[PDB]
Paper text:
Based on structural and biochemical studies, we report here that YugJ from B. subtilis is an atypical NADPH-dependent group III AAOR that reduces furan aldehyde in the presence of a Ni2+ cofactor. YugJ folds into a two-domain structure consisting of a Rossmann-like domain and an α-helical domain. YugJ interacts with NADP and Ni2+ using the interdomain cleft of YugJ.
The first crystal structure (space group P1) contains both the NADP cofactor and Ni2+ ion and was named YugJNADP-Ni. However, in the YugJNADP-Ni structure, the nicotinamide ring of NADP is disordered, and only the remaining NADP region was built. However, in the YugJNADP-Ni structure, the nicotinamide-YugJ interaction is not observed because of nicotinamide disorder. Thus, we propose that NADP(H) nicotinamide in YugJ prefers high structural dynamics for substrate recognition and becomes rigid upon substrate binding. Each protomer of the NADP-bound YugJ structures (YugJNADP-Ni chains A, B, C, and D and YugJNADP-NO3 chains A and B) adopts a closed conformation with a smaller interdomain angle, similar to that of YugJNi chain B. However, NADP binding restricts the interdomain organization of YugJ into the closed conformation. In contrast, the α9–α10 loop of the YugJNi and YugJNADP-Ni structures adopts an open conformation that increases the accessibly of the active site.
Author numbering:
A (entry chain A): -1 to 387
B (entry chain B): 2 to 350, 352 to 387
The structure:
């Protein structure tokens, strides 16, 4: 079957290399002088990046106001605070300095700053953005690829909901990616980032078989590179080369260069979002737990996709085995690989038992059946949740 | 390595997507210059489809026909004049890489009060350009999604590449059906070209590029799997689709992030085609294996990795140089198996090797994997006789 008709468009300027925070003045010159600096819980102050950014913004002659304390799984209360700061200070441009939570929050602020309503209306697709403030990023954690896409995931902590939204208007104008700026990412979140970029590859790879041989190999190649790099990096967290490789693969994993011509599945991500909506756990910690059990649950729909991963990525020999046997062996080896890094493999790792599984499944089903490789209903989610206990 | 990646082109891919022209043209002006080549788009029926879409879009169409393979700068200057004559707002390139590259030179030339050859020779750096889009009819160059252009001066016998951030296509429409009528020889050439572009980006000394290496090796493997089937089934949608898709990725910059390509074989090829006007990738098939052999000693590990990962060479009991040389033979055998030439004699080409070497050396020493001088290119040309 022909690949799906597609449109690829990604206008983000990706700036990569050591010391490239010094590109900020040149990149800021064409935009207005009122800048909102958005950042998280303080790791950029301890790494020294905060003072470097402040120095560059001073050099750029801009008036700086700040939104500090964006939380992991950024909250819409934080977004609305940022929108208010944009209104209060008549902000022209936003600079996101942090991880995916900071970038995702900044996208929601940029769109929320052109909308006279609750920013949660944008997250829930009640209002489709027609304008947005421009923004850029300095990335401090390799994981989500948000530095080079137009998507954003926001939590409503009052309603215990976590949803992804997107807009062609909230691509970053530029993103500055220096491996040195990820050196202080702790081991646990270094592991999470690698789980996340691998999971993004899986999401884009699990589609019905069609004429995507080069896309398949780009996906398999990214997985092999991360698998080769991850054990070395976790034991050598200040290694420039190892951080560089993972920073690079994190961007390609979700900038759209892998998803041309094929609809991703994204069901495991939606289930994970429901778990993090209730318990606030790290996104990719939930992915490491859930993805292998989604793969087991959906295998009968077509074992051929997982079989190809099992053979090309996970070293399974297929001689004398059915496709289902090969695929199941591969899923075990994926789960073993993540566990060998120290990633969690059961919900009990986050002190999550079965008390709220019905609530979590309901939240996953809030928009009806979902998934493109297999359509999932409440019984399916529930089965995947129970297997992940 | 430090790098900057930026590519704002909207890539529109799929069957029947020429019908996207009205929506994509809506935000631009109504004076469109349609640029195309020697008439193959009329023989395919594509010309009439485009005219129908431009009529649907309500635009005033003027035409520049007859852009030649290895587009000549005289055609560019005529195109600039047509832009001034008819107050053109937007250019639509409908053809191959020659047509798109010519259209890029017209788009920039239309904002410069002088000969566009100044732009090709980098005497004038474009400060503005007209916007343009493309409908691609041949899978080869990747010009549909980059900011580069290669223009020939047929009076001086020169062929040079130039570029500008201002001449990315606004959009490019890629329908595999529009490559169905590409004849066997140019189908072969396109696949040789895209593989060569991968080789150019792969032969560098930048240390830490493991994923780029695999993206390159993956593209080569995909083309190798597809090419023998396609040359015997030229109207197969699936096979044309794969080659159209890999052709764009091979030179849209998605493979060269963090690594400066070598590009020496291309510069030597450009000198050959400047004198003899042969197909770009016909020269590449002849030259590239001998460039690979000539530069092997600089670092046998690069070609060795290609030999093992792409060309199925078993390394047990062999030196890196032995593995690499086996890989080069298999690359050359593969291209020959498609019908690509393997010697300069295939194009009735040693009387003009000194001239070709001079033109290749016109900008001094070149090459990133190995720095080449006149003696080097002369040796590669002779090995290619
Ligand atoms: N995708 C979505 O994006 C979000 C996940 O984004 P993410 O995986 O990039 O992680 P994140 O939620 O943006 O940050 C995870 C943790 O990493 C810390 N951090 C970030 N960069 C650091 C650095 N250079 N050095 C030390 N600590 C650093 C952060 O602490 P600080 O807050 O103190 O910076 C934070 O606690 C989720 O909401 C997901 O759904
Ligand atoms: N890169 C650079 O780009 C140029 C090479 O570009 P290229 O390899 O893409 O080839 P090209 O030079 O743009 O065209 C090569 C030949 O293929 C014909 N052609 C294009 N599309 C066709 C189609 N759908 N059906 C039948 N024939 C078709 C052209 O004939 P027509 O002129 O009649 O269209 C031309 O004669 C070189 O200058 C190279 O340096
Ligand atoms: Ni994710
Ligand atoms: Ni080429």
């Amino acid at each position: 079957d022909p690949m799906h008709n597609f449109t690829y468009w990604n206008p983000t300027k990706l700036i990569f290399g050591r010391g490239e925070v010094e590109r900020l003045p040149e990149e800021l010159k064409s935009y207005g002088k009122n800048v909102l600096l958005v950042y998280g819980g303080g790791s950029i102050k301890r790494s020294g990046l905060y003072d470097q950014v402040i120095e560059q913004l001073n050099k750029a002659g801009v008036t700086v106001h700040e939104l500090a304390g964006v939380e992991p799984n950024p909250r819409v209360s934080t977004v609305n605070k940022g929108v208010a700061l944009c209104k209060e200070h008549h902000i022209d441009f936003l600079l996101a300095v942090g991880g995916g939570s900071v970038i995702d929050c900044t996208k929601a602020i940029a769109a929320g700053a052109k909308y006279d309503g609750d920013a949660w209306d944008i997250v829930t697709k009640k209002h489709q953005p027609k304008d947005a403030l421009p923004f850029g990023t300095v990335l401090t954690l390799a994981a989500t690829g948000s530095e080079m896409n137009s998507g954003s995931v926001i939590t409503n902590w009052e309603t215990k909901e976590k949803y992804g939204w997107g807009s062609p208007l909230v691509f970053p104008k530029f993103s500055i990616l220096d491996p040195v700026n990820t050196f202080t990412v702790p081991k646990n979140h270094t592991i999470y980032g690698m789980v996340d970029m691998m999971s993004h590859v899986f999401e884009q790879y699990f589609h019905h078989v069609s004429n995507t041989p080069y896309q398949d190999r780009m996906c398999e190649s990214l997985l092999r590179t991360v698998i080769e790099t991850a054990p070395k990096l976790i034991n050598d967290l200040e290694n420039y080369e190892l951080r560089e490789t993972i920073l690079y693969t994190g961007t390609i994993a979700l900038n759209g260069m892998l998803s041309m011509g094929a609809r991703g599945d994204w069901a495991t991500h939606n289930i994970e979002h429901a778990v993090s909506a209730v318990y606030d756990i790290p996104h990719a910690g939930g992915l490491a737990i859930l993805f292998p059990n989604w793969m087991r649950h959906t295998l009968s729909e077509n074992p051929a996709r997982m079989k190809q991963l099992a053979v090309r990525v996970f070293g399974v020999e297929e001689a004398g085995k059915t496709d289902k046997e090969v695929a199941l062996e591969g899923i075990d080896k994926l789960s073993a690989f993540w566990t060998s890094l120290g990633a969690p493999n059961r919900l009990a790792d986050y002190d999550i038992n079965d008390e709220q599984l019905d609530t979590i499944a309901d939240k996953a089903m809030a928009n009806g059946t979902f998934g493109q490789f297999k359509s999932l209903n409440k019984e399916d989610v529930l089965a995947i949740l129970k297997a992940s206990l």
